[PDB]
């Protein structure tokens, strides 16, 4: 409970912030201009995504296996 | 030697079991052969000359309470059968029910792959797939395993015993047939029509979609030219094997003189007292084709090679009309009446 237990407590939270933010950027990625939906955040869409970070360890680990957590050689532009 | 058959199902898939019983009583002479079937099926064994006495245990439920289970085993075992040949496609649970009956030769059917393919070690001569579609092919494995398998007994002992040869006791032949006939019009010169509606008529356990019924309009169109002409001039027998007191009030084959009867699977005599019969694929087909009884079978299409093997019964008497559309409730009813008007 000095380092390891608080440490795991952080790593759970840190992904939750990380995993949610990733979902939103992907979610708004397919729009006319994703620029506008990030300086003016869509609150409702960020509300139906805010809990999906409760299960990020499960969800991500499936992405890694399925191979959608990363891309390969298509980097800039698209 | 004693033998027990455990044939399953209702009527149409049990009336076809007579060839197997005759082959048993022919191969091993002087054999007491009993049978256990379902309540609706046991009704068929009231017209035969081989079985000793029937019984009723297995509609083959899932639960059946474990006192009616034991007592059934407690009556199969305590008569010491020798070869309990079976049906109903035993897997690995129903095989134990045969096995505990301490006989000598347990022969039956089994599931190919489904329902726990299994088939167990404690059996003998397990064979072909399950759903038992074709008729007069039927138990086709059985009419080969009981054929010359063993010994100097002659070459295959009369391969597939003559087709259905059901007999009628003269008591039932006279009294009940007469009473029900003369209730309404009766001359022994009428025509039976069977396929009407759907409660428990025969249902054939295998036809599936067609032959269950006709919309009773085709039946009216047929019947209006059946008695037309001095050929019969009697026949208005819609012969509803239903709760037809729930249907007789709607015989749009106008209720003027369209008679009606309620029957168990006893109607074999009523067929034998008719002047023909016109019906869909049902027990009436096999029953009429058993005797001479020129029949007219109207099932969907090309199922003849499954449900009607003796295409020429006596003189190509029993004729069959198919449906080019495939669905039974569309036929050249005009040509149907053309064919029917001759008999």
């Amino acid at each position: 409970g000095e380092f390891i237990t608080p440490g795991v407590l952080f790593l759970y939270i840190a992904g939750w912030i990380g995993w949610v933010g990733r979902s939103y950027l992907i979610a708004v990625s397919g729009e006319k201009k994703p620029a506008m939906r990030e300086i003016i955040i869509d609150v409702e869409l960020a509300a139906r995504i805010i809990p999906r970070g409760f299960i990020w360890p499960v969800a991500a680990y499936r992405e890694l296996i399925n191979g959608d957590l990363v891309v390969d050689d298509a980097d800039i532009g698209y | 030697r004693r033998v027990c058959c455990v044939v399953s199902g209702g009527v149409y898939e049990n009336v076809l079991f007579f060839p197997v019983v005759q082959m048993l009583k022919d191969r091993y002479p002087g054999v007491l052969v009993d049978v256990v079937a379902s309540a609706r099926g046991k009704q068929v064994y009231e017209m035969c000359k081989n079985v000793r006495y029937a019984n009723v245990y297995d509609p083959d439920d899932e639960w059946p309470e474990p006192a009616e289970y034991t007592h059934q085993l407690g009556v199969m075992k305590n008569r010491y059968y020798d070869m309990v040949l079976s049906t109903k496609l035993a897997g690995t649970g129903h095989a134990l029910f045969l096995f505990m009956s301490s006989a000598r030769e347990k022969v039956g059917y089994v599931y190919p792959n489904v329902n726990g393919a299994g088939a167990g070690l404690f059996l003998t001569e397990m064979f072909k797939p399950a759903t038992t579609n074709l008729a007069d092919g039927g138990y086709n494995m059985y009419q080969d395993m009981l054929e010359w398998l063993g010994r100097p007994a002659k070459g295959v002992p009369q391969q597939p015993i003559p087709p259905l040869r059901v007999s009628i006791s003269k008591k039932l032949r006279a009294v009940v047939e007469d009473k029900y006939n003369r209730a309404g019009v009766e001359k022994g010169k009428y025509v039976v029509i069977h396929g009407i509606e759907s409660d428990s008529v025969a249902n054939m356990k295998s036809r599936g979609d067609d032959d269950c019924l006709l919309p009773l309009e085709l039946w009216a169109e047929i019947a209006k030219e059946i008695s037309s002409g001095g050929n019969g001039l009697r026949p208005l027998f819609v012969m509803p094997h239903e709760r037809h007191r729930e249907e007789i009030e709607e015989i749009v084959g106008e209720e003027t003189a369209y008679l009606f009867i309620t029957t168990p699977g006893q109607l074999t005599c009523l067929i034998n007292d008719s002047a023909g019969v016109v019906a869909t694929n049902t027990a009436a087909v096999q029953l009429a084709n058993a005797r001479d009884k020129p029949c007219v079978a109207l099932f969907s299409s090309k199922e003849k090679a499954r449900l009607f093997l003796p295409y020429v019964e006596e003189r190509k008497s029993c004729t069959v009309v198919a449906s080019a559309t495939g669905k039974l409730a569309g036929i050249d009813i005009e040509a149907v009446k053309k064919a029917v008007k001759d008999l």
């Binding site: - | 639960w63 309470e65 474990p66 006192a67 289970y69 034991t70 505990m100 301490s102 404690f122």
Partner: protein
């Protein structure tokens, strides 16, 4: 919970015998070589 449970038990105590008897009755079954084999197995194991 009367027929399905306690009747089930009071029959399965009299039904499991009907199965066990015929089950252990269908091992060996002739073939004197098998008789002598199963007669030697017990002699050998009993030496412990």
């Amino acid at each position: 919970f009367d027929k399905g449970v306690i009747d089930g038990i009071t029959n399965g105590v009299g039904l499991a015998s009907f199965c066990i008897g015929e089950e252990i009755k269908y091992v060996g079954g002739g073939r004197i070589s098998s008789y002598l084999f199963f007669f030697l197995c017990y002699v050998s194991v009993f030496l412990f």
